[PDB]
Structure formats: structure tokens, C-alpha cells
Amino acid sequence: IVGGTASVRGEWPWQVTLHTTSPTQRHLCGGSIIGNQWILTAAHCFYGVESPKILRVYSGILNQSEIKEDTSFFGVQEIIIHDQYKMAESGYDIALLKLETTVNYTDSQRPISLPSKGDRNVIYTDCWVTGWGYRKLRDKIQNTLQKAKIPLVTNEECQKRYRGHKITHKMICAGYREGGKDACKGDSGGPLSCKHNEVWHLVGITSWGEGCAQRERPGVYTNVVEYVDWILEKTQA
Numbered sequence: 001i002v003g004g005t006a007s008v009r010g011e012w013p014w015q016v017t018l019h020t021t022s023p024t025q026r027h028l029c030g031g032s033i034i035g036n037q038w039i040l041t042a043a044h045c046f047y048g049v050e051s052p053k054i055l056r057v058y059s060g061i062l063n064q065s066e067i068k069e070d071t072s073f074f075g076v077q078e079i080i081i082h083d084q085y086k087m088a089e090s091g092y093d094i095a096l097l098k099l100e101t102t103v104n105y106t107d108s109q110r111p112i113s114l115p116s117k118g119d120r121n122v123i124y125t126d127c128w129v130t131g132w133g134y135r136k137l138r139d140k141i142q143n144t145l146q147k148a149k150i151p152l153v154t155n156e157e158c159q160k161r162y163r164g165h166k167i168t169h170k171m172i173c174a175g176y177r178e179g180g181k182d183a184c185k186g187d188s189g190g191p192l193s194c195k196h197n198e199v200w201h202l203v204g205i206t207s208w209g210e211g212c213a214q215r216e217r218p219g220v221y222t223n224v225v226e227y228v229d230w231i232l233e234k235t236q237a
């Protein structure tokens, strides 16, 4: 997260850090708890993932340095990638992880609500992007989970910034026109979380952008409300 600030314990209890153990263990992507055995994340995270056996989902983590040999994690039974997905910039950048066990909810690990289908066109004004990603283009994964409040940008304005890519109704853009705050490397798959009428909703999945936090180059997020039926279908199978 460029231009973000430190989160506190229990602030973002739906945020997870998805690690791969192969060839060596490392943070791969963010994700969000959405159900009792379900993480919602980005399809592009799995480009080099040979099998679900190498994945570990860590919930209830503030600092990456908390992740040691005996730290509790959830295994992954199945990776479900949207069957129309090809590449982040062409959309459908959405995936589910079916966990090996159910998740017992606490103040440090609990699900975020999907957006209401009735709020399909709502212009949310209390939206936050979170993650352990870079603070600038050439940086490192951060220890403490960072947050940044970022405004939504209309798809019409967003499309003007990305003449080389189709910004579809299944994408949502967010960023400051004057730049300065955005997702960056290591944040993808995590949430764009918006608080509306005292309830947090998972409005976006961090997907792609051109550079990090540049002027007039908003971040592009999977528009979760446009996939509610797909999510319900896959999570009940």
C-alpha cells in the first residue's frame, strides 16, 4: 500500500495473508474471509501455483513476523478460478479458496459481507484498501498490515485513463486523481472494503493498475457485486 498507515490488531478481521510454501514459504497475495470455509481472492494469484497443497491461509495476523512454525493456519482443499479468466486486465479476476476446515469466528477472524445486489450502483464513500504490499514500485513486503482510504472513480473516468484496456462494468476503479495512495506489489487479492450503514462490504478485489499511486492512474479492482451469483454457486457446490 502506497501512502498508507499501520493497522491495529483486530481492525481488518476478514483480511488474510495467503502464503505459498514452494519452493520456500512466502506471502503471495491478500484475500478475504467470506464464509465458514471460504476465502475470496484474485485469480491471477495462482499463475505459478502447482497445487492447493502448497497454500496456507493465515488469518488473525497483523504482522508477517507473527508467522512461525507453530502459527495456526488454514489449509486449502480446492482453488476455484473463474472459468472466463485469462489475465487481470481482461477481467474475471476472481477466485475462491475452499479451506480444509471451517473457520471459528472471533474478533480477529470473521467474514466480510458481500455487497448487497440492491446496492449494485451505490457510490460508496468510506472505502479502504489493505495489505502487506510495497509502499513504492521498488520496495519490500511490509511487516504490519497497512491501510489507505481511497475514493471510488467512475468507470467513465477510469476508462479515460486506460485507453489500452477495457474497463468493464465488472471492474471498479479507485484512487486519487492527484495520486499518492493505492495498492502496490503484494496487495493483490486483498479487499477493497467499504463501510456502508455500519456494515463492511467487500466491494472490490485488488487486481491491477499502471504503476503504483500515479496521478490519473487509479487502481482497478474486481467489482464483487457483479459476481455474487457466481460466488453463491461455487460456495454451495
Ligand SMILES: C[C@@H]1CCC[C@H](n2cnc(-c3cc(Cl)ccc3-n3cc(Cl)nn3)cc2=O)c2cc(ccn2)-c2c(cnn2C(F)F)NC1=O
Pocket: 027, 028, 029, 044, 045, 046, 047, 048, 133, 134, 137, 141, 182, 183, 184, 185, 186, 187, 188, 189, 206, 207, 208, 209, 210, 211, 212, 213, 218, 219, 220, 221
Ligand atoms: C503472483 C502474485 C501476484 C502478482 C500480481 C501482484 N500485483 C499486481 N498489481 C497490483 C496493483 C493493483 C492495483 Cl489496484 C494497482 C496497482 C497495482 N500495481 C501496479 C504495479 Cl507495477 N504494482 N502493483 C498489485 C499486486 O499485488 C504482484 C505481487 C508481487 C509482485 C508483483 N506484482 C509479489 C507477490 C509476492 N511477493 N511479491 C512482491 F514482489 F511484491 N505475489 C505475486 O507475484
Ligand SMILES: *[C@@H]1O[C@H](CO)[C@@H](O)[C@H](O)[C@H]1NC(C)=O
Pocket: 101, 102, 103, 104
Ligand atoms: C471450533 O470450535 C469448536 C468448539 O470449541 C472446536 O471443537 C473445534 O475444534 C474448532 N474448530 C476449528 C476449525 O477451529
